[PDB]
Amino acid sequence: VEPFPRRPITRPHASIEVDTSGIGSEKVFCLIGQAEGGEPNT
């Protein structure tokens, strides 16, 4: 939702704001167990 000139100007100009996110739950799974690698808490 950025105007095309990021900072608005006072002069006579054309200003364009575009819904960038209009062109575009997961139910995440988890596992805990022994491993030989990685941080002990992260």
Next chain:
Amino acid sequence: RPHASIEVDTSGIGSEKVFCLIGQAEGGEPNTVYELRNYSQAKRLFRSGELLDAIELAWGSNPNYTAGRILAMRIEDAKPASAEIGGLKITSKIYGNVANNIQVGLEKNTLSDSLRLRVIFQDDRFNEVYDNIGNIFTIKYKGEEANATFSVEHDEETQKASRLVLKVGDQEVKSYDLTGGAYDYTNAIITDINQLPDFEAKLSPFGDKNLESSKLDKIENANIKDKAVYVKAVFGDLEKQTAYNGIVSFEQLKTIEPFELTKLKGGTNGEPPATWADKLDKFAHEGGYYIVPLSSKQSVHAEVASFVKERSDAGEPMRAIVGGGFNESKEQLFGRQASLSNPRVSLVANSGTFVMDDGRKNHVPAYMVAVALGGLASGLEIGESITFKPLRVSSLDQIYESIDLDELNENGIISIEFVRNRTNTFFRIVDDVTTFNDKSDPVKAEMAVGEANDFLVSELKVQLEDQFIGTRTINTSASIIKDFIQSYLGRKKRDNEIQDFPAEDVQVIVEGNEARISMTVYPIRSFKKISVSLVYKQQT
């Protein structure tokens, strides 16, 4: 008066997506942008270096999508060769150590009684002689009196020819004060001198030099009746000698003297700058979109990334492709991608070899490949993708496997995969991914999608500014605005630059100065998965 008039229009015959390059070069002026169209023009400008090789690669990267109007720059803070002899100052046009080997040398011709200049530069097979320096006109006498002399002297306050006098015996026939009057050039002087009953000032047979009247040299008390005396003006005449042909310029700080065929000095290429910020600023308002620095340095990459972001903030969107090193491990590529993490930057992993038109099997780092990819991208239409396009690279330093390619693409790294027996080339581009690794976001992740959006916005902005701002507000303005937009959107659809747009959704509102507008578009995409299922059936 009555007359016929004729007009012609051409706007219907026809963005261009200009491509940029900055790097090391062996010739051309520093801190100066140029527009290139032909290879001969770049060879004349840039004598040699990697930059010329990059221009050649860019205009030969692909068979079908070579770029155009490439913008080039020399980063070397070079200086031109120069030398000093007598009262002269010698300075060469060329910047760098190449001008040192330009040979310059003044001589004298006894037959013509005139100085001679000869300049030779064996690298370009240059060899010319400027005979008959000075010797502007000959003064001749046809009378039978006791003596006849002339005299020209300078004005010391300005070194201008104070007078020009013809004498019979001791007194004067007619004197031309050259500091004043309308006799600014020698031809105005000779045209009137020849009208005298018994005197001639024939312009020299060695061409029509036609030099300034004020620049005549200092000669006095010479026999006209015995000799066709020469007024010379060597320094002013050297401008006529070097009017159009000549690599080396001349100036006078004094008297000029002949000297040996001496080579120039002081020509310096200079060290390369550490930071390209001042160099990059010159491309602020040049209209370029794709820029690629010819450097493997991460500092330069960060500087370019800052530059393209600033230009995109100012309403001039730009993108960059970077690379470096020879046979860089995957760890370095991931480190570089994590350091950048910019949507408007793309990283190239593979480095290889290219067959120049000159016949050189040039083994080059990875940024030269990023040049080639940039020149292919700029060659493509607005919003068309560089996916699976041929590259025509001769060979590569690595052949990544189907797992290595999947890891590079998942890390937002561009890579090239070896492929056998295809009609065009033995290589293709796997993907047009950016360094921003958010694959969920299609604008930031895909180069093509964001380029389509940026060119759509820029063209809409330019056209709306050009057309309606500064005009009148009348009843038909709103309808006209809507019609112009619909026409633009239909043009974009016709060119396949968007998928589709609903016409009814376009709305226009006009109130005083403002003009509030709104619209909907279905944006362009290029396929990235193609699925085909088959069903088998029989009859008994």
Next chain:
Amino acid sequence: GGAYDYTNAIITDINQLPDFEAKLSPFGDKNLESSKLDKIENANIKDKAVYVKAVFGDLEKQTAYNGIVSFEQL
């Protein structure tokens, strides 16, 4: 603080002098901050090409994007 935070500005200013030549090292991207430079006491510049070292900064820079091991100065 300011423009001289990194060695780049130091190199450009030295090279700006006509009497000096301070080409950056060609072996990859060092570009170390100017705070980490090692001490020097009147090293002759006329007869020699004096190299500023800054050992531990370059050790950190090279071993940053490569390898499992990490290092710390005592």
Next chain:
Amino acid sequence: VEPFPRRPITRPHASIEVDTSGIGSEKVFCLIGQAEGGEPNTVYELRNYSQAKRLFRSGELLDAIELAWGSNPNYTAGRILAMRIEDAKPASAEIGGLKITSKIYGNVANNIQVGLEKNTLSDSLRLRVIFQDDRFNEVYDNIGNIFTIKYKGEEANATFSVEHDEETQKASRLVLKVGDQEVKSYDLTGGAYDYTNAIITDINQLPDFEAKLSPFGDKNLESSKLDKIENANIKDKAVYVKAVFGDLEKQTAYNGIVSFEQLKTIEPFELTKLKGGTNGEPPATWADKLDKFAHEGGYYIVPLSSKQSVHAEVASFVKERSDAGEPMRAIVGGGFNESKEQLFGRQASLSNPRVSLVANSGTFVMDDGRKNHVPAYMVAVALGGLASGLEIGESITFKPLRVSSLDQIYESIDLDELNENGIISIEFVRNRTNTFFRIVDDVTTFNDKSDPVKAEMAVGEANDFLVSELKVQLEDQFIGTRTINTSASIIKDFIQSYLGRKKRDNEIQDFPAEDVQVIVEGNEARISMTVYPIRSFKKISVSLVYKQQTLQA
């Protein structure tokens, strides 16, 4: 609303009385803070970063301006008023006959360097100013040579004298003598001769003497400021009238960083640094500093100080402005990483509806790449900047802060406690695919929530803006106008139009039109109306109920 022409005439004609009208709040945000530049006890308007950086050279106030403009990237960069707190003084030096003083206030001004020189060819003085902190350099060349005088007569004696008024030392006469008598004397008593141009022309009018206006920049000085030259051989050589004291005003005073005066004669001197530049220290009493924002139209004001004394003085100030007819509100933030006890003690200390407290402190990524860790009051400036960016009556509840990281990422308990006790608090929302910081509430320091006008910032802002606009417009419109028979109805239609325009902008919910009743009696006009105040959602309940349904074919 004037006639064309603007000159009534009685003879037959056709006049036009065009009315050009009918074809036509800003919520300014104020700031007070520290900077290396700008005068003391003065307020300046800001609209651009470069503009702020010109005056406010460096300091925490610049960072606060940048944070306030950056606190609402989706919205425009609005007007901001800024003030310096330090009682700073300018650098000045006295060298030669001139008093030299710089325009910059503070210790930076001391780096300014000024020196006078002379040019041999033009027989003229020269001025140069250098300021090495910004590579600034200016030269005012050709000081003097205001106009020449030349004498073309054949007599042996020809000179000129300028005589001064002895009491005031002002140039009083420009005398031109031949032989031993005054051929002409421009007695500067009156007329067009007060300006040197007229003198120059009349000298040109003389048969012998002639005066040429200076080609080295047309100066056109008043005759009273000319210099004094005597026994100068005008006949033999052109004599230069100089009037360097006039050249001061012509060149040096209207331009450049440094101002110049005279205490003595102007003479050359070497480039010398100015001295005496002092930043000063803030005063014990802040009431004088706030009073400059009396008539500036600002509504939100935030000082860059965690001290409770400043907070109380600001609270007393804004209350006094609100009593005076200019409602204003303030937001403050306490120290670095302050505990909840301190927030409770500050809130119990203030207990003001027109004051809000901010708890969270964190880090902001500045445009210069700096991860500027900052105290809570800088966050209060960010909230003021966001509130100013919103429309009238809006609420900063659940809006994104756009911070980088926070020192204290609170849980539900702390946020509930702070909300109940009337302290604004901000959370890093963890529950999501992608993470951000939001403001949980906009409750004022007033603890009791029985009256939402006092408790809620948005409601009290809408009420204050509505009342102020209605009051000002009613003064501007109907006071001093005739009490005709249609006045009451006109007033009703105007108020209905004002309320409808408020409703259109969504600053108010709705009103009953019929309840807008106007009574006129004598000099007084009595009006009664009702308006439903705009409210912002802060609690949503959903009573979902499941059911079963059967299907057939």
